[PDB]
Amino acid sequence: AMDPEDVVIDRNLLILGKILGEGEFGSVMEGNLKQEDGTSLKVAVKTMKLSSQREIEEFLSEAACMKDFSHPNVIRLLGVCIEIPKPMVILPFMKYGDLHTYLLYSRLETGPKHIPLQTLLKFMVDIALGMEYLSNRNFLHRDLAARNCMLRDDMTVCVADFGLSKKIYSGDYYGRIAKMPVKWIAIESLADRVYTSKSDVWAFGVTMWEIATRGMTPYPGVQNHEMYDYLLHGHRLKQPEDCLDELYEIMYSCWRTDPLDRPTFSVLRLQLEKLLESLPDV
Ligand SMILES: Cn1cc(-c2cnc(N)c(C(=O)N[C@H]3CCC[C@@H]3OCc3ccc(-c4ccc(C(C)(C)N5CCN(CC=O)CC5)cc4)cc3)c2)cn1
């Protein structure tokens, strides 16, 4: 581990806590990071169930690039701790957790109160702003979904889970790609497993539909194994109940068969901001 970009944090400065979530490709843990002035900082730690020195050095160069992300709607990586080397990414702790679980909790009496239409649109604007920033830096996210967007203590949404994210043209580091959820994958990416910025636009449309349905799984009544054939026949996500016709037309533009017919994040973000401006206060 040469690390010329100084992204590695001394492992001894990190105290691991409770596991927040576990999956086939890693886990998220609560943690404390001892700062220079002796005061501890509450952080989240993402581990990955993978190795080589060149693979870890390439991993640290990618981490160093993500550490320079400066946008309120994009999570900022604090550093990487190493443990055969086992890397763990250190992130700021997002109080409210992921947006998907938050939408589900909102449908319970004890959870957050009923989310107004305007607040749902504001979550979509936030994600579009974050994706516009990443897209302008030539990043492909490749795993955009409401479960991968986080809520800060001020209720601003930030795009997170950069585990499959890569610059366009860069080497594909990884397997981990082939096991991703089929219901967020663009039709051309199911047929060839190749992603572009237009594949992220498709996933963004799916994420807007998740927000508008308050956390429903995409395509009710359709099984994962039928998805490619379903999309090949021209079928798309149906309009949710109480979803403005204007908002649904923005979602449907994300799922045009030809990726080149789909809009960019800059255009989507402006269309959503204009629609939100045209609505009354809550
Ligand atoms: C119940 N509860 C939970 C909380 C909670 C509170 N606060 C949090 N921050 C989290 C929380 O963190 N939750 C994560 C789960 C999903 C969404 C969110 O994700 C964050 C996140 C960001 C960034 C990464 C990343 C991963 C690899 C990399 C490198 C650079 C290492 N890799 C190298 C390999 N390349 C290959 C490319 O193909 C990709 C990039 C760089 C960043 C990975 C994960 C959870 C509260 N309540």
Ligand SMILES: [Cl-]
């Ligand atoms: Cl549907």
Ligand SMILES: [Cl-]
């Ligand atoms: Cl419909």
